[PDB]
Amino acid sequence: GLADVAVLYSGGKDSNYALYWAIKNRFSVKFLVTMVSETINANLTDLQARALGIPLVKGFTEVEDLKRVLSGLKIQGIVAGSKYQRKRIEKVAKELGLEVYTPAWGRDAKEYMRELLNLGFKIMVVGVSAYGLDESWLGRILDESALEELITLNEKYKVHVAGEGGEFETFVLDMPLFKYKIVVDKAKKVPCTSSGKLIIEEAHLESKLE
Amino acid sequence: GLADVAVLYSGGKDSNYALYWAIKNRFSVKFLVTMVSETINANLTDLQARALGIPLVKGFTEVEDLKRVLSGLKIQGIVAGSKYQRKRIEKVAKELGLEVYTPAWGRDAKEYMRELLNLGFKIMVVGVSAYGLDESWLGRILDESALEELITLNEKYKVHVAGEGGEFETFVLDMPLFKYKIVVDKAKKVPCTSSGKLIIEEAHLESKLE
């Protein structure tokens, strides 16, 4: 009634952490909200929404568009997953008279990443844009072993261990809240620079006993 | 402000007609709502939502689930596309204190279908479940020629010219309101009975100059 909120869901580790945080903090998540600007590679959050059972609202566009979509939802606040993007979301939250939560902000990278692993988050690298991360990273799962490598790479090339700054993009395949697990069947990964993306061609949900 | 509504969108001719009717009647369509029960063949309405530019809300399940999703939207009514399904939607509309519009109801089949053609609706048969409609129908576009055949088939096997009763299912590829046209690139159509479905494997949007 007064704990009603929408979660800004991009399908990555931060969107999913913001979702987990919201539920564990007694918030009532009415909707996951994803914005799309001008295949299953585009409906990945849909796949996750199904696994979650939480209604997904999709808007199309970039700031005004989001505001307009949120304004049509009966919520008291929104949970968000750059450093100024924060204020851009606080701007719309204030203009719409909504509370804004950013559970994933000043958290220490190393600690943050370790917490996602203990919580049972299964994360896959879907994009890389940093020197010291060849295409080999595209498609790998982030486990304790992977985190250690990111820590090392950090102590050399100073790459953020949480991908902060476009270092790398992620997609959550599984989490305690997912009623279903996501499995990637076909993927195409596409270097002078250090730009690279993983295109999920085929994927499906597998029932979990929870 | 008081003309705010959601459209029950299944992606067929009736959902799209209900959308067209709503817009032309000065209604403010805040959301298209699709329910999914337990590839692009599942996100077809997403493809249409993109072509339309109208936010799409997806719920998961069947009547309670819909009610719960609608209750989280700031709308004054809903526009709907069996004969008792009507009352099932009027039931949730009343319980949620919302107006209910069914622009596609007592309309004469022949007239209705002819009106969709003049309005510029490009419709493809995606399912068939009636004697007198072999697999050949699966995937064909409904033009004046096709309507005439449905009229003939009606004057013989008495098959509804609008598919009323599971006769056939449809998917709108284009309409005056679509900013983009939908094109099917790959499709797989799957007879002792008369059951048959068309599975759209690959499709894309092509820009329109409007």
PDB file of C-alpha atoms in Angstrom, chain A:
ATOM      1  CA  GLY A   1       0.000   0.000   0.000  1.00  0.00           C
ATOM      2  CA  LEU A   2       2.848   2.387   0.813  1.00  0.00           C
ATOM      3  CA  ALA A   3       5.764   0.059   0.051  1.00  0.00           C
ATOM      4  CA  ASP A   4       4.729  -0.239  -3.592  1.00  0.00           C
ATOM      5  CA  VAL A   5       7.661   0.180  -5.952  1.00  0.00           C
ATOM      6  CA  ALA A   6       8.967  -0.445  -9.440  1.00  0.00           C
ATOM      7  CA  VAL A   7      12.447  -1.766 -10.087  1.00  0.00           C
ATOM      8  CA  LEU A   8      14.587  -0.335 -12.933  1.00  0.00           C
ATOM      9  CA  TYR A   9      15.551  -3.670 -14.498  1.00  0.00           C
ATOM     10  CA  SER A  10      18.225  -3.884 -17.221  1.00  0.00           C
ATOM     11  CA  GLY A  11      18.859  -7.585 -16.589  1.00  0.00           C
ATOM     12  CA  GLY A  12      22.357  -7.191 -15.159  1.00  0.00           C
ATOM     13  CA  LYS A  13      23.767  -7.912 -11.698  1.00  0.00           C
ATOM     14  CA  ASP A  14      22.933  -4.424 -10.402  1.00  0.00           C
ATOM     15  CA  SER A  15      19.290  -4.526 -11.574  1.00  0.00           C
ATOM     16  CA  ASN A  16      18.912  -7.936  -9.973  1.00  0.00           C
ATOM     17  CA  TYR A  17      20.645  -6.889  -6.787  1.00  0.00           C
ATOM     18  CA  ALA A  18      18.300  -3.884  -6.558  1.00  0.00           C
ATOM     19  CA  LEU A  19      15.419  -6.368  -6.960  1.00  0.00           C
ATOM     20  CA  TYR A  20      16.740  -8.697  -4.276  1.00  0.00           C
ATOM     21  CA  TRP A  21      17.381  -5.786  -1.919  1.00  0.00           C
ATOM     22  CA  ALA A  22      13.831  -4.505  -2.445  1.00  0.00           C
ATOM     23  CA  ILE A  23      12.162  -7.810  -1.660  1.00  0.00           C
ATOM     24  CA  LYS A  24      14.328  -8.519   1.387  1.00  0.00           C
ATOM     25  CA  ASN A  25      13.561  -5.049   2.708  1.00  0.00           C
ATOM     26  CA  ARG A  26       9.781  -5.750   2.730  1.00  0.00           C
ATOM     27  CA  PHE A  27       9.123  -3.639  -0.342  1.00  0.00           C
ATOM     28  CA  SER A  28       6.250  -4.616  -2.580  1.00  0.00           C
ATOM     29  CA  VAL A  29       7.653  -4.867  -6.116  1.00  0.00           C
ATOM     30  CA  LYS A  30       4.724  -4.179  -8.423  1.00  0.00           C
ATOM     31  CA  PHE A  31       6.742  -3.895 -11.638  1.00  0.00           C
ATOM     32  CA  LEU A  32      10.144  -4.298 -13.256  1.00  0.00           C
ATOM     33  CA  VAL A  33      10.718  -1.494 -15.742  1.00  0.00           C
ATOM     34  CA  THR A  34      12.952  -1.723 -18.798  1.00  0.00           C
ATOM     35  CA  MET A  35      13.407   0.992 -21.420  1.00  0.00           C
ATOM     36  CA  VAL A  36      14.253   0.113 -25.028  1.00  0.00           C
ATOM     37  CA  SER A  37      15.720   2.615 -27.492  1.00  0.00           C
ATOM     38  CA  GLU A  38      15.938   2.552 -31.307  1.00  0.00           C
ATOM     39  CA  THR A  39      15.248 -12.637 -31.330  1.00  0.00           C
ATOM     40  CA  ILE A  40      15.589 -13.171 -27.573  1.00  0.00           C
ATOM     41  CA  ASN A  41      18.641 -10.908 -27.294  1.00  0.00           C
ATOM     42  CA  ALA A  42      16.215  -7.978 -26.985  1.00  0.00           C
ATOM     43  CA  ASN A  43      13.720  -9.707 -24.724  1.00  0.00           C
ATOM     44  CA  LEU A  44      16.250 -10.985 -22.175  1.00  0.00           C
ATOM     45  CA  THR A  45      14.554  -9.160 -19.325  1.00  0.00           C
ATOM     46  CA  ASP A  46      11.298 -10.799 -20.489  1.00  0.00           C
ATOM     47  CA  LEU A  47      12.929 -14.163 -20.028  1.00  0.00           C
ATOM     48  CA  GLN A  48      13.961 -13.086 -16.546  1.00  0.00           C
ATOM     49  CA  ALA A  49      10.541 -11.589 -15.809  1.00  0.00           C
ATOM     50  CA  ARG A  50       9.000 -14.997 -16.561  1.00  0.00           C
ATOM     51  CA  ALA A  51      11.540 -16.693 -14.282  1.00  0.00           C
ATOM     52  CA  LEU A  52      10.641 -14.151 -11.606  1.00  0.00           C
ATOM     53  CA  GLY A  53       6.884 -14.018 -11.978  1.00  0.00           C
ATOM     54  CA  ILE A  54       6.994 -10.236 -11.601  1.00  0.00           C
ATOM     55  CA  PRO A  55       5.095  -8.092 -14.179  1.00  0.00           C
ATOM     56  CA  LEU A  56       7.417  -6.380 -16.665  1.00  0.00           C
ATOM     57  CA  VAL A  57       6.640  -2.975 -18.139  1.00  0.00           C
ATOM     58  CA  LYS A  58       8.477  -2.009 -21.306  1.00  0.00           C
ATOM     59  CA  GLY A  59       8.806   1.581 -22.401  1.00  0.00           C
ATOM     60  CA  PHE A  60      10.173   2.854 -25.718  1.00  0.00           C
ATOM     61  CA  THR A  61      12.483   5.727 -26.624  1.00  0.00           C
ATOM     62  CA  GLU A  62      15.378   9.009 -23.017  1.00  0.00           C
ATOM     63  CA  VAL A  63      14.688  10.640 -19.665  1.00  0.00           C
ATOM     64  CA  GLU A  64      11.242  12.042 -20.503  1.00  0.00           C
ATOM     65  CA  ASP A  65      10.131   8.681 -21.894  1.00  0.00           C
ATOM     66  CA  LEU A  66      11.004   6.936 -18.583  1.00  0.00           C
ATOM     67  CA  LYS A  67       9.204   9.571 -16.545  1.00  0.00           C
ATOM     68  CA  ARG A  68       6.112   9.195 -18.702  1.00  0.00           C
ATOM     69  CA  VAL A  69       6.072   5.414 -18.229  1.00  0.00           C
ATOM     70  CA  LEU A  70       6.596   5.568 -14.458  1.00  0.00           C
ATOM     71  CA  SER A  71       3.850   8.197 -14.114  1.00  0.00           C
ATOM     72  CA  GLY A  72       1.348   5.598 -15.254  1.00  0.00           C
ATOM     73  CA  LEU A  73       2.220   3.167 -12.442  1.00  0.00           C
ATOM     74  CA  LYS A  74       0.707   3.100  -8.931  1.00  0.00           C
ATOM     75  CA  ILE A  75       3.968   3.202  -6.949  1.00  0.00           C
ATOM     76  CA  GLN A  76       5.464   5.230  -4.063  1.00  0.00           C
ATOM     77  CA  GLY A  77       9.057   4.819  -5.203  1.00  0.00           C
ATOM     78  CA  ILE A  78      11.542   3.195  -7.574  1.00  0.00           C
ATOM     79  CA  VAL A  79      14.662   1.105  -6.981  1.00  0.00           C
ATOM     80  CA  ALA A  80      17.600   1.710  -9.289  1.00  0.00           C
ATOM     81  CA  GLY A  81      20.463  -0.695  -9.908  1.00  0.00           C
ATOM     82  CA  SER A  82      27.823   6.603 -14.516  1.00  0.00           C
ATOM     83  CA  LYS A  83      27.834   8.693 -11.337  1.00  0.00           C
ATOM     84  CA  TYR A  84      25.560  11.463 -12.627  1.00  0.00           C
ATOM     85  CA  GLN A  85      22.996   8.978 -13.939  1.00  0.00           C
ATOM     86  CA  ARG A  86      22.033   8.744 -10.271  1.00  0.00           C
ATOM     87  CA  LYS A  87      20.892  12.341 -10.144  1.00  0.00           C
ATOM     88  CA  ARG A  88      19.127  11.926 -13.484  1.00  0.00           C
ATOM     89  CA  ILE A  89      17.008   9.235 -11.801  1.00  0.00           C
ATOM     90  CA  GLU A  90      16.594  11.307  -8.648  1.00  0.00           C
ATOM     91  CA  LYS A  91      15.381  14.135 -10.897  1.00  0.00           C
ATOM     92  CA  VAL A  92      12.519  12.073 -12.371  1.00  0.00           C
ATOM     93  CA  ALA A  93      11.783  10.505  -9.005  1.00  0.00           C
ATOM     94  CA  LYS A  94      11.355  13.962  -7.434  1.00  0.00           C
ATOM     95  CA  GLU A  95       9.371  15.379 -10.374  1.00  0.00           C
ATOM     96  CA  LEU A  96       7.024  12.390 -10.158  1.00  0.00           C
ATOM     97  CA  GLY A  97       6.868  12.697  -6.391  1.00  0.00           C
ATOM     98  CA  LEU A  98       8.467   9.289  -5.846  1.00  0.00           C
ATOM     99  CA  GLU A  99      11.075   7.966  -3.401  1.00  0.00           C
ATOM    100  CA  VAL A 100      14.338   6.775  -4.983  1.00  0.00           C
ATOM    101  CA  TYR A 101      16.454   3.894  -3.698  1.00  0.00           C
ATOM    102  CA  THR A 102      19.999   3.134  -4.861  1.00  0.00           C
ATOM    103  CA  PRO A 103      21.083   0.150  -2.729  1.00  0.00           C
ATOM    104  CA  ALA A 104      24.018  -0.369  -5.138  1.00  0.00           C
ATOM    105  CA  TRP A 105      26.063   2.831  -4.843  1.00  0.00           C
ATOM    106  CA  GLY A 106      28.839   3.613  -2.390  1.00  0.00           C
ATOM    107  CA  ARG A 107      29.372  -0.115  -1.829  1.00  0.00           C
ATOM    108  CA  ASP A 108      32.962  -1.273  -2.064  1.00  0.00           C
ATOM    109  CA  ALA A 109      33.428  -3.095  -5.361  1.00  0.00           C
ATOM    110  CA  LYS A 110      35.280  -6.128  -3.991  1.00  0.00           C
ATOM    111  CA  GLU A 111      32.801  -6.498  -1.127  1.00  0.00           C
ATOM    112  CA  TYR A 112      29.831  -5.914  -3.407  1.00  0.00           C
ATOM    113  CA  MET A 113      30.926  -8.595  -5.871  1.00  0.00           C
ATOM    114  CA  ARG A 114      31.678 -11.079  -3.088  1.00  0.00           C
ATOM    115  CA  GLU A 115      28.222 -10.495  -1.614  1.00  0.00           C
ATOM    116  CA  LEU A 116      26.535 -11.240  -4.984  1.00  0.00           C
ATOM    117  CA  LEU A 117      28.399 -14.560  -5.113  1.00  0.00           C
ATOM    118  CA  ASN A 118      27.416 -15.618  -1.571  1.00  0.00           C
ATOM    119  CA  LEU A 119      23.834 -14.657  -2.242  1.00  0.00           C
ATOM    120  CA  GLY A 120      23.843 -17.256  -5.035  1.00  0.00           C
ATOM    121  CA  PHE A 121      23.970 -14.982  -8.088  1.00  0.00           C
ATOM    122  CA  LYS A 122      24.883 -16.695 -11.360  1.00  0.00           C
ATOM    123  CA  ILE A 123      26.293 -13.977 -13.602  1.00  0.00           C
ATOM    124  CA  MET A 124      27.517 -14.123 -17.203  1.00  0.00           C
ATOM    125  CA  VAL A 125      29.698 -11.504 -18.888  1.00  0.00           C
ATOM    126  CA  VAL A 126      27.817 -10.207 -21.933  1.00  0.00           C
ATOM    127  CA  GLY A 127      29.976  -7.257 -22.845  1.00  0.00           C
ATOM    128  CA  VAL A 128      33.560  -6.093 -22.441  1.00  0.00           C
ATOM    129  CA  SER A 129      35.069  -2.649 -23.036  1.00  0.00           C
ATOM    130  CA  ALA A 130      38.353  -2.490 -21.168  1.00  0.00           C
ATOM    131  CA  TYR A 131      41.997  -3.276 -21.900  1.00  0.00           C
ATOM    132  CA  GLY A 132      42.985  -6.494 -20.198  1.00  0.00           C
ATOM    133  CA  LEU A 133      39.786  -8.367 -21.052  1.00  0.00           C
ATOM    134  CA  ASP A 134      39.970 -10.199 -24.386  1.00  0.00           C
ATOM    135  CA  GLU A 135      36.987 -11.840 -26.048  1.00  0.00           C
ATOM    136  CA  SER A 136      37.592 -14.909 -23.884  1.00  0.00           C
ATOM    137  CA  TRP A 137      35.653 -13.126 -21.138  1.00  0.00           C
ATOM    138  CA  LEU A 138      32.561 -12.759 -23.288  1.00  0.00           C
ATOM    139  CA  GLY A 139      30.282 -15.565 -22.112  1.00  0.00           C
ATOM    140  CA  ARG A 140      32.095 -16.694 -18.979  1.00  0.00           C
ATOM    141  CA  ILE A 141      30.314 -17.161 -15.646  1.00  0.00           C
ATOM    142  CA  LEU A 142      31.480 -15.063 -12.683  1.00  0.00           C
ATOM    143  CA  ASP A 143      32.500 -17.402  -9.860  1.00  0.00           C
ATOM    144  CA  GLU A 144      35.015 -17.032  -7.042  1.00  0.00           C
ATOM    145  CA  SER A 145      37.778 -17.928  -9.476  1.00  0.00           C
ATOM    146  CA  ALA A 146      36.662 -15.228 -11.916  1.00  0.00           C
ATOM    147  CA  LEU A 147      36.441 -12.570  -9.193  1.00  0.00           C
ATOM    148  CA  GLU A 148      40.045 -13.291  -8.172  1.00  0.00           C
ATOM    149  CA  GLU A 149      41.128 -12.711 -11.795  1.00  0.00           C
ATOM    150  CA  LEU A 150      39.223  -9.431 -11.872  1.00  0.00           C
ATOM    151  CA  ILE A 151      40.983  -8.445  -8.640  1.00  0.00           C
ATOM    152  CA  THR A 152      44.382  -9.206 -10.176  1.00  0.00           C
ATOM    153  CA  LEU A 153      43.523  -7.392 -13.413  1.00  0.00           C
ATOM    154  CA  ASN A 154      42.494  -4.504 -11.170  1.00  0.00           C
ATOM    155  CA  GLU A 155      45.879  -4.454  -9.435  1.00  0.00           C
ATOM    156  CA  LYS A 156      47.508  -4.037 -12.835  1.00  0.00           C
ATOM    157  CA  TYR A 157      45.309  -2.259 -15.360  1.00  0.00           C
ATOM    158  CA  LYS A 158      43.054  -0.846 -12.636  1.00  0.00           C
ATOM    159  CA  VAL A 159      39.876  -2.268 -14.184  1.00  0.00           C
ATOM    160  CA  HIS A 160      36.862  -1.981 -11.866  1.00  0.00           C
ATOM    161  CA  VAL A 161      36.019  -5.344 -10.323  1.00  0.00           C
ATOM    162  CA  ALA A 162      32.310  -4.587 -10.745  1.00  0.00           C
ATOM    163  CA  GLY A 163      32.556  -3.315 -14.306  1.00  0.00           C
ATOM    164  CA  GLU A 164      31.795   0.220 -13.141  1.00  0.00           C
ATOM    165  CA  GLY A 165      32.560   2.466 -16.109  1.00  0.00           C
ATOM    166  CA  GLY A 166      31.669   0.227 -19.028  1.00  0.00           C
ATOM    167  CA  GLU A 167      34.407  -2.239 -18.078  1.00  0.00           C
ATOM    168  CA  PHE A 168      32.006  -5.119 -18.689  1.00  0.00           C
ATOM    169  CA  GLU A 169      28.284  -5.877 -18.941  1.00  0.00           C
ATOM    170  CA  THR A 170      26.469  -8.745 -17.230  1.00  0.00           C
ATOM    171  CA  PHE A 171      23.315 -10.848 -17.425  1.00  0.00           C
ATOM    172  CA  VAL A 172      21.922 -12.797 -14.468  1.00  0.00           C
ATOM    173  CA  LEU A 173      21.045 -16.359 -15.400  1.00  0.00           C
ATOM    174  CA  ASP A 174      19.981 -17.410 -11.912  1.00  0.00           C
ATOM    175  CA  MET A 175      19.243 -16.075  -8.487  1.00  0.00           C
ATOM    176  CA  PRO A 176      17.459 -17.219  -5.319  1.00  0.00           C
ATOM    177  CA  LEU A 177      14.354 -15.300  -6.375  1.00  0.00           C
ATOM    178  CA  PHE A 178      14.251 -16.855  -9.863  1.00  0.00           C
ATOM    179  CA  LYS A 179      11.696 -19.654  -9.895  1.00  0.00           C
ATOM    180  CA  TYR A 180      13.346 -20.808 -13.114  1.00  0.00           C
ATOM    181  CA  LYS A 181      16.956 -20.996 -14.237  1.00  0.00           C
ATOM    182  CA  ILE A 182      18.014 -19.513 -17.593  1.00  0.00           C
ATOM    183  CA  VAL A 183      20.228 -21.580 -19.898  1.00  0.00           C
ATOM    184  CA  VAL A 184      22.037 -20.176 -22.968  1.00  0.00           C
ATOM    185  CA  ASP A 185      22.040 -22.655 -25.861  1.00  0.00           C
ATOM    186  CA  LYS A 186      23.454 -20.570 -28.701  1.00  0.00           C
ATOM    187  CA  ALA A 187      25.594 -17.457 -28.419  1.00  0.00           C
ATOM    188  CA  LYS A 188      27.704 -15.439 -30.853  1.00  0.00           C
ATOM    189  CA  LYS A 189      30.534 -13.312 -29.470  1.00  0.00           C
ATOM    190  CA  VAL A 190      31.801 -10.479 -31.665  1.00  0.00           C
ATOM    191  CA  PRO A 191      40.196  -6.718 -31.536  1.00  0.00           C
ATOM    192  CA  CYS A 192      42.155  -3.467 -31.889  1.00  0.00           C
ATOM    193  CA  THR A 193      40.232  -1.701 -29.106  1.00  0.00           C
ATOM    194  CA  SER A 194      38.693  -3.698 -26.292  1.00  0.00           C
ATOM    195  CA  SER A 195      35.066  -3.522 -27.289  1.00  0.00           C
ATOM    196  CA  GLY A 196      33.138  -6.774 -27.459  1.00  0.00           C
ATOM    197  CA  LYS A 197      29.605  -8.095 -27.034  1.00  0.00           C
ATOM    198  CA  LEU A 198      27.962 -11.488 -26.599  1.00  0.00           C
ATOM    199  CA  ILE A 199      24.780 -12.014 -28.612  1.00  0.00           C
ATOM    200  CA  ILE A 200      22.530 -14.668 -27.030  1.00  0.00           C
ATOM    201  CA  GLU A 201      20.828 -16.383 -29.989  1.00  0.00           C
ATOM    202  CA  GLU A 202      19.020 -19.197 -28.161  1.00  0.00           C
ATOM    203  CA  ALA A 203      18.140 -19.658 -24.469  1.00  0.00           C
ATOM    204  CA  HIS A 204      15.450 -21.326 -22.353  1.00  0.00           C
ATOM    205  CA  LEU A 205      14.136 -21.640 -18.788  1.00  0.00           C
ATOM    206  CA  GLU A 206      14.551 -24.829 -16.728  1.00  0.00           C
ATOM    207  CA  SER A 207      12.268 -25.547 -13.803  1.00  0.00           C
ATOM    208  CA  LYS A 208      13.713 -25.239 -10.293  1.00  0.00           C
ATOM    209  CA  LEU A 209      12.349 -27.073  -7.205  1.00  0.00           C
ATOM    210  CA  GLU A 210      11.852 -24.172  -4.812  1.00  0.00           C
TER     211      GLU A 210
END
